[PDB]
Amino acid sequence: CQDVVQDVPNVDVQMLELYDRMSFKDIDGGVWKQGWNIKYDPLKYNAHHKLKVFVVPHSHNDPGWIQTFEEYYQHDTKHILSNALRHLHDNPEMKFIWAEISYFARFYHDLGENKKLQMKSIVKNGQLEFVTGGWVMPDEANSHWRNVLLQLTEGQTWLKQFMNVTPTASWAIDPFGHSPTMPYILQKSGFKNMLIQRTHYSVKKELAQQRQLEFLWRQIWDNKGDTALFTHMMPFYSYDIPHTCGPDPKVCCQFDFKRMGSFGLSCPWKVPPRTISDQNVAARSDLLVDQWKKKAELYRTNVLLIPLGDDFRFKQNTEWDVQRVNYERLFEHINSQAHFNVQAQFGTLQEYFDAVHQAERAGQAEFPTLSGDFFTYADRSDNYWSGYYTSRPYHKRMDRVLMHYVRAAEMLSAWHSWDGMARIEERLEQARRELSLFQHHDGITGTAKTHVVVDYEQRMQEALKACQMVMQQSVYRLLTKPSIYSPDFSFSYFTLDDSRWPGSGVEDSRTTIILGEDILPSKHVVMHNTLPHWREQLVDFYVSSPFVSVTDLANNPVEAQVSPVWSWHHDTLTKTIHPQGSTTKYRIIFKARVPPMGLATYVLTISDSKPEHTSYASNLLLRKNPTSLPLGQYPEDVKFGDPREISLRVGNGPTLAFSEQGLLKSIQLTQDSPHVPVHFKFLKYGVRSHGDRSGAYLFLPNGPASPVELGQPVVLVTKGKLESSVSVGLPSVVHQTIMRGGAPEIRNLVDIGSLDNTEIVMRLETHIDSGDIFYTDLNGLQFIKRRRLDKLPLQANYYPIPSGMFIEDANTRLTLLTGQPLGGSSLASGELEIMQDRRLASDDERGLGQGVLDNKPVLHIYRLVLEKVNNCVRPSKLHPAGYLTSAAHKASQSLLDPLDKFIFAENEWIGAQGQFGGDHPSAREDLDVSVMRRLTKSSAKTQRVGYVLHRTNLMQCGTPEEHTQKLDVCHLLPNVARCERTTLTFLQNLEHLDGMVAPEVCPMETAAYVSSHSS
Ligand SMILES: OC[C@@H](NC[C@H]1NC[C@H](O)[C@@H]1O)c1ccccc1
Ligand SMILES: *[C@@H]1O[C@H](CO)[C@@H](O)[C@H](O)[C@H]1NC(C)=O
Ligand SMILES: [Zn+2]
Cα–Cα separations (whole angstroms), residue 887 to 3, 532, 916: 21, 17, 27
- State the closest ligand 1 atom to the C-alpha of 442, by its place in the atom list counted from 1: 10
Which helix (H) or strand (E) segment holds residue 1012: the answer is strand 1006-1013
| Spatial contact of 185 and 984, defined as CB atoms under 8 Å apart | yes
Single-letter code of the amino acid located at 331: F
* R_g of the chain, CA atoms, integer Å: 30
- State the closest ligand 1 atom to the C-alpha of 697, by its place in the atom list counted from 1: 8
List b or e across 67-100, with b for residues whose CB sees 16 or more CB atoms inside 10 angstroms: bbbeebbeebbbbbbbbbbebbbebeebbbbbbb
Q: Give the bridge partners for 930, in sequence order.
A: none
Which has the closest alpha carbon to 659: 674, 672, 640, 678? 678
| Spatial contact of 492 and 472, defined as CB atoms under 8 Å apart | yes
| Spatial contact of 96 and 319, defined as CB atoms under 8 Å apart | no
- To test ligand 1's pocket by mutation, which of 103, 241, 311, 388 has the most ligand atoms within 8 angstroms of CB? 311
| Cα gap 182→231, rounded to integer Å | 11
| Cα gap 446→279, rounded to integer Å | 50
3-state secondary structure string, 645-709? CEEEECCCCCEEEECCCCCEEEEECCCCCCCEEEEEEEEEECCCCCCCCCCCCCCCCCCCCEECC
Residue 314's SS3 state is coil
Residue nearest atom 18 of ligand 1, based on CA coordinates: 847
What lies within 8 Å, CB to CB, of 701 at 6+ separation is 685, 686, 687, 688, 694, 759, 794, 795
CATH of domain 1-381: 3.20.110.10
Residue nearest atom 1 of ligand 1, based on CA coordinates: 238
* 683 Cα distance to chain centroid: 26
| Cα gap 127→123, rounded to integer Å | 6
Q: Which ligand is nearest to the CA of 117?
A: 2
Q: How many CB atoms lie within 10 A of CB 366?
A: 7
- To test ligand 1's pocket by mutation, which of 68, 76, 174, 312 has the most ligand atoms within 8 angstroms of CB? 174
- State the closest ligand 1 atom to the C-alpha of 846, by its place in the atom list counted from 1: 17
What lies within 8 Å, CB to CB, of 663 at 6+ separation is 679, 680, 681, 728, 735
Residues with CB under 6 A from ligand 1: 60, 62, 65, 174, 238, 240, 311, 441-442, 847
Q: How many CB atoms lie within 10 A of CB 244?
A: 29
Residue nearest atom 3 of ligand 1, based on CA coordinates: 311
| Spatial contact of 897 and 466, defined as CB atoms under 8 Å apart | no
| Spatial contact of 717 and 638, defined as CB atoms under 8 Å apart | no
Residue 641's SS3 state is strand
Cα–Cα separations (whole angstroms), residue 269 to 255, 259, 262, 654: 13, 12, 18, 64
What lies within 8 Å, CB to CB, of 102 at 6+ separation is 63, 69, 135, 136, 155, 433, 436, 437
701 C-alpha to center of ligand 1: Å? 23
Backbone φ and ψ for 19, nearest 5 degrees, come out as -60, -35
What lies within 8 Å, CB to CB, of 232 at 6+ separation is 193, 194, 195, 196, 213, 214, 305, 353, 356
Which has the closest alpha carbon to 826: 797, 802, 803? 797
Q: Is the dihedral of CA 546, 551, 556, 558 positive or negative?
A: negative
Q: Is the dihedral of CA 18, 24, 27, 32 positive or negative?
A: positive
Q: Which ligand is nearest to the CA of 312?
A: 1
**Cis bond upstream, residue 502 (ω within 30):** yes
64 C-alpha to center of ligand 3: Å? 9
Which has the closest alpha carbon to 845: 400, 379, 190, 307? 379
139 C-alpha to center of ligand 3: Å? 9
- Greatest CA span in the chain, whole angstroms? 100
- State the closest ligand 1 atom to the C-alpha of 60, by its place in the atom list counted from 1: 12
Tell me which long-range contacts 483-488 makes (C-beta under 8 A, separation of at least 24). 484/910, 484/911, 485/911, 487/422
847 C-alpha to center of ligand 1: Å? 6
Backbone φ and ψ for 811, nearest 5 degrees, come out as -115, -25
275 C-alpha to center of ligand 3: Å? 29
Q: How many CB atoms lie within 10 A of CB 678?
A: 23
Single-letter code of the amino acid located at 646: I
Cα–Cα separations (whole angstroms), residue 739 to 303, 526, 649, 865, 976: 61, 24, 8, 12, 44
3-state helix, strand, coil in the chain (%, to 5): 25, 30, 45
88 C-alpha to center of ligand 2: Å? 21
Which has the closest alpha carbon to 165: 204, 125, 112, 108? 125
994 C-alpha to center of ligand 2: Å? 28
Q: Which ligand is nearest to the CA of 445?
A: 1
Fold for 920-1015, please state it.
Immunoglobulin-like (2.60.40)
- State the closest ligand 1 atom to the C-alpha of 441, by its place in the atom list counted from 1: 10
Q: Is the dihedral of CA 35, 38, 44, 48 positive or negative?
A: positive
Superfamily of domain 618-897: Golgi alpha-mannosidase II; domain 4 (2.70.98.30)
Q: Which ligand is nearest to the CA of 988?
A: 2
| Cα gap 67→452, rounded to integer Å | 6
Angle at 899 between CA 392 and CA 869, to 5 degrees: 80
What lies within 8 Å, CB to CB, of 236 at 6+ separation is 32, 35, 204, 243, 244, 247
| Cα gap 305→768, rounded to integer Å | 49
Using the 8-state DSSP alphabet, how is residue 439 labeled? T
Cα–Cα separations (whole angstroms), residue 649 to 130, 725, 726, 740, 766: 57, 10, 12, 9, 20
In terms of C-beta density within 10 A (0-12 exposed, 13-18 middle, 19 or more buried), how is residue 23 classed? exposed
Pairing mode of beta strands 303-311, 51-60:
parallel
User: Torsion over CA of 400, 405, 411 and 415, rounded to 10 degrees?
Assistant: 180
| Cα gap 225→216, rounded to integer Å | 9
Residue 183's SS3 state is helix
**Cis bond upstream, residue 964 (ω within 30):** no
Residue nearest atom 17 of ligand 1, based on CA coordinates: 847
| Cα gap 437→975, rounded to integer Å | 36
Residue nearest atom 7 of ligand 1, based on CA coordinates: 174
Q: Give the bridge partners for 991, in sequence order.
A: 981
Domain layout of the chain by residue ranges: 1-381, 382-492, 493-617+898-919, 618-897, 920-1015
Residue nearest atom 14 of ligand 1, based on CA coordinates: 847
3-state secondary structure string, 857-879? CEEEEEEEEEEECCCCECCCCCC
Across the beta sheet with 804-808, the strand order is 639-641, 618-622, 715-719, 724-730, 733-739, 745-750, 858-868, 812-818, 804-808, 773-778, 782-787, 881-882
| Cα gap 940→884, rounded to integer Å | 43
| Cα gap 192→200, rounded to integer Å | 24
- State the closest ligand 1 atom to the C-alpha of 447, by its place in the atom list counted from 1: 8
| Cα gap 408→990, rounded to integer Å | 27
Q: Which ligand is nearest to the CA of 845?
A: 1
Using the 8-state DSSP alphabet, how is residue 938 labeled? T
Single-letter code of the amino acid located at 724: S
686 C-alpha to center of ligand 1: Å? 26
Using the 8-state DSSP alphabet, how is residue 76 labeled? I
- To test ligand 1's pocket by mutation, which of 67, 253, 698, 846 has the most ligand atoms within 8 angstroms of CB? 846
Q: Which ligand is nearest to the CA of 239?
A: 1
Which has the closest alpha carbon to 445: 396, 498, 516? 396
In terms of C-beta density within 10 A (0-12 exposed, 13-18 middle, 19 or more buried), how is residue 410 classed? buried
In terms of C-beta density within 10 A (0-12 exposed, 13-18 middle, 19 or more buried), how is residue 290 classed? middle
Q: How many CB atoms lie within 10 A of CB 27?
A: 11
| Cα gap 395→393, rounded to integer Å | 5
Declared resolution, Å: 1.5
Using the 8-state DSSP alphabet, how is residue 390 labeled? T
307 C-alpha to center of ligand 1: Å? 16
E strand intervals along 767-857: 773-778, 782-787, 799-801, 804-808, 812-818, 822-825, 831-839
- State the closest ligand 1 atom to the C-alpha of 845, by its place in the atom list counted from 1: 17
- Class in CATH terms, 493-617+898-919: mainly beta
Q: Which ligand is nearest to the CA of 163?
A: 2
Backbone φ and ψ for 541, nearest 5 degrees, come out as -135, 155
| Cα gap 556→679, rounded to integer Å | 42
Q: Is the dihedral of CA 245, 249, 251, 257 positive or negative?
A: positive
| Cα gap 315→19, rounded to integer Å | 41
541 C-alpha to center of ligand 1: Å? 46
Pairing mode of beta strands 303-311, 214-217:
unpaired
Which helix (H) or strand (E) segment holds residue 570: the answer is strand 560-571
Backbone φ and ψ for 80, nearest 5 degrees, come out as -55, -50
| Cα gap 340→660, rounded to integer Å | 78
Residue nearest atom 4 of ligand 1, based on CA coordinates: 311
E strand intervals along 402-521: 494-497, 512-513
Q: Is the dihedral of CA 98, 184, 429, 855 positive or negative?
A: negative
| CATH match for 382-492 among 1.20.1270.50, 1.20.210.10, 3.10.450.40, 3.40.50.300 | 1.20.1270.50
| Cα gap 584→421, rounded to integer Å | 41
What lies within 8 Å, CB to CB, of 600 at 6+ separation is 526, 527, 529, 552, 592, 593, 594, 914, 915
| Spatial contact of 543 and 561, defined as CB atoms under 8 Å apart | no
Residue nearest atom 6 of ligand 1, based on CA coordinates: 174
| Spatial contact of 170 and 152, defined as CB atoms under 8 Å apart | no
320 C-alpha to center of ligand 2: Å? 30
- State the closest ligand 1 atom to the C-alpha of 240, by its place in the atom list counted from 1: 1
Q: How far apart are the first and last CA of the chain?
A: 35
| Spatial contact of 841 and 848, defined as CB atoms under 8 Å apart | no
Which helix (H) or strand (E) segment holds residue 762: the answer is strand 758-766
846 C-alpha to center of ligand 1: Å? 6
Among all residues, which ones are annotated catalytic? 174
* 618-897 and 920-1015 share one fold: no
